[PDB]
Design a protein around this ligand. Structure first.
Ligand SMILES: Cc1ncc(C[n+]2csc(CCOP(=O)(O)OP(=O)(O)O)c2C)c(N)n1
Ligand SMILES: Cc1ncc(C[n+]2csc(CCOP(=O)(O)OP(=O)(O)O)c2C)c(N)n1
Ligand SMILES: [Mg+2]
Ligand SMILES: [Mg+2]
Lengths: 539, 539
């Protein structure tokens, strides 16, 4: 019962914004889990494996701004490694807690289970260094301030951190903090900010019209409000790329569609690439987001804002918080921007599938799309207001979407969750559907059944057997992963049928699994343009 | 069609003893897979996720002495890390091939999918260093001799290796080798071997009773044949530990049961620990194998043989191949060893389940038991001749057994495979059952349904909610993971029913899944002694 390091960690964890802890137990963390169970502030969420748990934590942090994952030493942590890496790649603040053997056992070099048999206990700690921003081995002498330093670094960088918690250290006495862990707002040096403002002001005084391109880093740094308000006060052509989709209400004036480099719609190209001044806010021009680096945006044409630095033309201004750079640009845009941007089929195909989905989505939806024709077709959806669109095109790990949806629904139990996963992707993390059923979640899961890896087929070897998959009976999965699923599952092959099923599952009273029958070679237009561009770089 | 680096690697793969390649495809390895498909010697086995493929490759190499795994850069390779780590811990030679972006893309530092977004392409290569014995990044300038070096080190050490294969490097021209990659037999220095022989002689000429203790390192180095011939030619009390189970036909004279430290049966304790000289051949005294390091074997009592060194009493003799140490001891034992070892219930319990399983096993069986009550009860089984008993008590990653069984069945399609997995463990790799169904395998899968993690319950917090799991509908799983399963499933709750069901499934005419209902608190005797031992070290 006495307050201890385990309780301190859980206290700090809630301060950061996580009300749940994902993971799977092991003998090295059971005593820590006692404090999780006993805590009135954090809810334990056992998952079906550690990889899914790390994915779910990622989806949770994309909804609540923070997440935590608990695994056991060695077998647990190394299983979650692909998940933490994806969190690092896409700037998701997920805390990895690793329950470990007591320090005396470690110092004695004992041949314990979950080790390499060499008596070494730091292999996996060091292996996790490239995919976290901060890390620590908690000791009796450092525990509380190493907890605080790692979590603070995660909050500042919006990226994963790692804590190793030996069983004995977790029971060490601690003191409840009077002060809650605070996200200290950084302020740039006044001269540096003025120098950035002066160069931006000179550049913005050049613009004949200005366009705004924002992406996922404004989502991670809690700047969604700022960019929405910014387009309101200064109406201009604005867009996101795939990663940042959902920043804006896509029905509003000034929005013409998602930007994907040369794969963009013609109206979008003129809106973004045709503007003489483009403001890039939190952008990363990855190969997928630019359809093979086919974006036409010169440095002199752009003003770029990143988490700790901003660029005007060829000059970088470092040590400037993203927020201040945005407030500067918003203030300057009220000065120099003056323009107003003048305020049902038979057989299912990709084209009519997404057309049907367009009529189904609603404000407040949480939409998750996996790599493949799912995410590459979802890019064409015109999202209404208050849509959380979760996609992972930089890391691109298939299977993330199904497990991340379990985490997202846990984060937002009162919101309608739409899961768009390919058949290939869903096989990698299928067991989390059981967790969804056990927790009585009601997402609308759409499995795109094209009988294999269609995006791989389009890239190379459509004929090749390695692009096939085992053919599952998708509508029967919930009845196997639950003793009383109470789900409603359909297998659809016509647009009429799909539209009717959508109205039936509209109010998500039960878990819904819709198996969508699609052709093997049918690809959305973004994938077509991606493969066309691949002719040059991949030969 | 021209012979190239991809063809060279596959040829070397066959030379090492692999007829299959496991993994999941990605755009960075599709062109390599074309050579896998076209090869008449190497068969592609697409898996449901990379973790399962790495587990399956481990199971494959435990049957054929070598295995290979193919993943895609970043998301594939990092998913398989827990499997490669288990292979390293238990000395299983699994080759990890990683398809990577072309060298030109990497050098340009491009923002590619499956990267961290930093332009760095070597993060994951270094992350895999602690869990491999050799690694290389193949270039146009090193590929064929780096392939040979890594595989050679894998063969010598019996441990995993890693190769990064850029797509452009795989297409580079190569030359078919005239000679096959050969496991050159190392030889000790004659004086060094004589020094060990003299010290062993001296000690062995003193023994009034001698016992032989062998374990998993004799399996990995292909010495199982040698050690059974040893006990045949020199009858003595012999045993293995859990990891090495299956080295000896356990029905032979001189065998009294598996050695597990203080958890051993009284006859086993007297047979091994009561001998004045015990020969430990390829042993590692891990916590599980010794029931909490409760083995009573003094250094003066033992002669120990390890892969590159052996010890007599307090003196180590390094640079001696295990084979030579064993041949010497065999020769010395025919001289100085003189001893002759004098030639149905109702409700299901752990006790009557293992008694029932004892009557079911046959020579030629492949038995896999996962961590938990499965592996801890399976240790009491009296194995007949020619049994491959696969268990992972050092790494101890639950979920390994189900996927490894798919690998073992692939290695041995004509052998009867019995999978003993807990309900918790099977949830981690369930998607591999789909792979077994797709490939028309016929394992006997026994799921120990005690409705949660019983071994964790035995350790701490039996009533705690963290020890619960989602309750699956096991008998319906094949019907969900296959459109037409060659499968039959049973649910049993009595010793009566299990015996009848095993009779029906005797000749493995189809895949059979038996849901065995067991009590939540029912524990095998080994687990009881382990938890009793935990009173001292874990407090
Ligand atoms: C973990 C992981 N393994 C492998 C890949 C390589 N990969 C990229 S797309 C793809 C196919 C996706 O298949 P599916 O979900 O069926 O999509 P669709 O048919 O809609 O394209 C694969 C295997 C990946 N992205 N992530
Ligand atoms: C990958 C992994 N995650 C977590 C653990 C921790 N662990 C050890 S035993 C165990 C319970 C296994 O449960 P089950 O398979 O049902 O076995 P049983 O109830 O028969 O003991 C767990 C979770 C582990 N060994 N491996
Ligand atoms: Mg598909
Ligand atoms: Mg169990």
């Amino acid at each position: 019962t006495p307050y201890c390091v385990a309780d301190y960690l859980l206290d700090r964890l809630t301060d950061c914004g996580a009300d749940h802890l994902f993971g799977v137990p092991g003998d090295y963390n059971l005593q820590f889990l006692d404090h999780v169970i006993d805590s009135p502030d954090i809810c334990w969420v056992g998952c079906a494996n550690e990889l899914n748990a790390s994915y779910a934590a990622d989806g949770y942090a994309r909804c609540k701004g923070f997440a935590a994952l608990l695994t056991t030493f060695g077998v647990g942590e190394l299983s979650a490694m692909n998940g933490i890496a994806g969190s690092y790649a896409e700037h998701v603040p997920v805390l990895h807690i690793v329950g470990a053997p007591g320090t005396a056992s470690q110092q004695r070099g004992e041949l314990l289970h979950h080790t390499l048999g060499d008596g070494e206990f730091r292999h996996f700690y060091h292996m996790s260094e490239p995919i976290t921003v901060a890390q620590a081995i908690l000791t009796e002498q450092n525990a509380c301030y190493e907890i605080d330093r790692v979590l603070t670094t995660m909050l500042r960088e919006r990226r994963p951190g790692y804590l190793m918690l030996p069983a004995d250290v977790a029971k060490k006495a601690a003191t409840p903090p009077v002060n809650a862990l605070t996200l200290r707002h950084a302020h740039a040096d006044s001269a540096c900010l003025k120098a950035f403002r002066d160069a931006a002001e000179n550049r913005l005084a050049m613009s004949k019209r200005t366009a705004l391109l924002a992406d996922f880093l404004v989502l991670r740094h809690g700047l969604k409000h700022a960019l929405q308000k910014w387009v309101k006060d200064v109406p201009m052509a604005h867009a996101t790329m795939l990663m940042g989709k959902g920043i804006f209400d896509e029905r509003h004036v000034g929005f013409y569609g998602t930007y994907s480099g040369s794969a963009s719609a013609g109206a979008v190209k003129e809106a973004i690439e045709g503007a003489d001044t483009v403001l890039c806010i939190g952008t990363r021009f990855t190969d997928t987001l630019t359809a093979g680096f086919t974006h036409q945006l010169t440095p002199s044409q752009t003003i770029e804002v990143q988490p700790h630095a901003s660029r005007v033309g060829d000059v970088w201004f470092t040590g400037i918080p993203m927020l201040q750079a945005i407030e500067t640009l918003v203030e300057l845009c009220k000065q120099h921007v003056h323009d107003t941007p003048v305020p049902p089929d038979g057989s299912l195909t990709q084209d009519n599938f997404w057309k049907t989905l367009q009529t189904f989505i609603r404000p407040g939806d949480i939409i998750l799309a996996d790599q493949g024709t799912s995410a590459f077709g979802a890019i064409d959806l015109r999202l209404p207001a208050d849509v959380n669109f979760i996609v992972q095109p930089l890391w691109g790990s298939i299977g993330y979407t199904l497990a991340a949806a379990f985490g997202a629904q846990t984060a937002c139990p009162n919101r309608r969750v739409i899961v768009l996963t390919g058949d290939g992707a869903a096989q990698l993390t299928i067991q989390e559907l059981g967790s969804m059923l056990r927790d009585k979640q009601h997402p609308i899961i759409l499995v795109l059944n094209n009988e294999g890896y269609t995006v791989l087929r389009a890239i190379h070897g459509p004929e090749q057997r390695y692009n096939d998959i085992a053919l599952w009976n998708w509508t029967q999965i919930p009845q196997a992963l639950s003793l009383d699923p109470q789900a409603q599952c359909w297998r659809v092959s016509e647009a009429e049928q799909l539209a009717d099923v959508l109205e039936k599952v509209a109010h998500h009273e039960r878990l819904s699994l819709i198996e969508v029958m699609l052709p093997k070679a049918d690809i959305p237009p973004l994938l077509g343009a991606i493969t066309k561009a691949l002719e040059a770089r991949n030969s």
